[PDB]
Every structure is written in structure tokens, then in C-alpha cells.
Design a protein around this ligand. Structure first.
Ligand SMILES: CC(C)n1cnc2/c(=N/c3cccc(Cl)c3)nc(NCCO)[nH]c21
Length: 261
């Protein structure tokens, strides 16, 4: 009964062209009409019956307030005869941006300093979420968006991927914010490599055993050992040994300082 204001009136909302389709749902561009009278550019995620439970998640998420975490604006429901509403991000997802940057006509070559900023942002977003005791469960560069001012924020959290999952979750189904810390390490690598799929040579079905024998992602070509140490700490076998997001965040910030201007 309480979280019912999270719901937005379907006619306040107008949908446009499709921006992508995964097996789950489809993401669309649209316009949301506001209190102002003004309209705001939004992105609309669709998915597919004990449903109340889902609504509470959106209610929770709506409470999130951090510049490095996306703000869910509300939800719509077209009656089964459910769509989440998020601010539109014109620069798109971080993964596709890294790839574009390796091409002419696309964004200039991202220098090291900017690659670190990217990671700091995500570290910060995850710091905040880890404090709220919120478990992400799908962190990857494809799920990090670029703001109009080139800030990175975290998106797609939860909503009900093998190469991003930590050993213990792969094995026992267990998942804690340390498992997210594992995903973050993989994400960092994605950025260091400017969009390589993790574990080249290793097929998905081999992943668990490849990790079980203590094998990790390899160090990228011209990567500082410091940066590599940091990402590697994210994948220590015991979750307890892995650093926390606030421990990580500060390491990246101090490293960024260490680099020339
Ligand atoms: C659902 C949330 C996270 N969201 C918010 N904005 C976007 C988004 N924006 C853009 C921006 C530039 C080009 C395109 Cl195709 C989509 N794209 C996507 N996805 C399309 C490519 O990954 N998702 C977006």
C-alpha cells in the first residue's frame, strides 16, 4: 500500500524508438511529463506472477541518491491484457564507449587518467550501495552509464553473466557484497583493456574449474603493477580477504594523484 507513489501514471509517459533488445526485455527512449509541466528525456526498460515483491525493489531503488548511482524515477504498468523509468544517458553504456574510443570518428583515445576516473566513479557508486547493504548482482561495464558530463554511474542493479561471477557464487550460490567486489575487479579490467571480453581463450563452461585451479585474469599490456595489484585483490579466493569498496575507492583516488597532471 505504502510504496504506490513509486508508480507513475502511464499517460504521463510517451515511448519512442527501441535502443536495444536482450533475451530479458527491451530498452526504449521516451518522454516523461512532470510536475513542472516540462518533459524529461528518459529510458524505459521492459520485462515480464507474485508481482508486489518486484514493486518494493523499485521503491527501495527510488530512495538511492548518489551522483555515481543512477536514480530510478518510477515504474509503469501496462496491464497484462511493467516498465522501469530512468533518466536518458546520451553517452550510453561505458562498455560500448570504450570500444568506440578505439575507433576514429568515435571519442578520442581515453588516456590513463580518464580510465582511472571511470573506475573511481564506480568505486564510489558501489561504496554507497555497500553501505545501504544493497547487493548489486550484475556489475559489469555494460551496466555502467556515462552522464552528460562524463561522470560514470552504476545501473541495472538486480532486476531478478558467468565471467563476472565470483568462485563461491559459482560453486555454492552464496552472494555477498564481496561477490560484487569480485565483479568490480572484472569491470576494472574491462576498462583497462578498453572492452575485451574477460578470459580470452577460456570458454564459459570452463570458468569454474579454471578459477578453481587458481587462475585469474591476466595483466593488460601497459598497465601499472599498482593498478593490477588492485584488481587482483578483488579476486582472492576467500571473500573475507578481498578489500571493501571504501578500501578500494581510496586506493584508486591516491593512484590517480600519483600520475602526472
Ligand atoms: C536503461 C538505462 C541504463 N539507460 C539510460 N540511458 C540509456 C541509453 N542511452 C543511450 C545513449 C546514446 C545512444 C543510445 Cl543507443 C542509448 N542506452 C541504454 N542502452 C542501449 C545501449 O547499451 N540504456 C540506457
Amino acid at each position: 500500500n505504502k510504496l504506490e507513489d513509486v508508480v507513475i501514471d502511464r499517460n504521463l509517459l510517451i515511448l519512442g524508438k527501441i535502443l536495444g533488445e536482450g533475451e530479458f526485455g527491451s530498452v526504449m527512449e521516451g518522454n516523461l511529463k512532470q510536475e513542472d509541466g516540462t518533459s524529461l528525456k528518459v529510458a524505459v526498460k521492459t520485462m515480464k506472477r507474485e508481482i508486489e515483491e518486484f514493486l518494493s525493489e523499485a521503491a527501495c531503488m527510488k530512495d538511492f541518491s548518489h551522483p555515481n548511482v543512477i536514480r530510478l524515477l518510477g515504474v509503469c504498468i501496462e496491464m497484462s491484457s511493467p516498465m522501469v523509468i530512468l533518466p536518458f544517458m546520451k553517452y550510453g553504456d561505458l562498455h560500448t564507449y570504450l570500444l568506440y574510443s578505439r575507433l576514429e570518428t568515435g571519442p578520442k583515445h581515453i588516456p590513463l587518467q580518464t580510465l582511472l576516473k571511470f573506475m573511481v566513479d564506480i568505486a564510489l557508486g558501489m561504496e554507497y550501495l555497500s553501505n545501504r547493504n544493497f547487493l548489486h548482482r550484475d556489475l559489469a561495464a555494460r551496466n555502467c552509464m556515462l552522464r552528460d558530463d562524463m561522470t560514470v554511474c552504476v545501473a541495472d542493479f538486480g532486476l531478478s553473466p558467468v565471467k563476472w561471477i565470483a568462485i563461491e557464487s559459482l560453486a555454492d550460490r552464496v552472494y555477498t557484497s564481496k561477490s560484487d567486489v569480485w565483479a568490480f575487479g572484472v569491470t576494472m579490467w574491462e576498462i583497462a583493456t578498453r572492452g575485451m571480453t574477460p578470459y580470452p581463450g577460456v570458454q564459459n563452461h570452463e570458468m569454474y574449474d579454471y578459477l578453481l585451479h587458481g587462475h585469474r585474469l591476466k595483466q593488460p599490456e601497459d598497465c601499472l603493477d599498482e593498478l593490477y595489484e588492485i584488481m587482483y585483490s578483488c579476486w582472492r579466493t576467500d571473500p573475507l580477504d578481498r578489500p571493501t569498496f571504501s578500501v578500494l575507492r581510496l586506493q584508486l583516488e591516491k593512484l590517480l594523484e600519483s600520475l602526472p597532471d
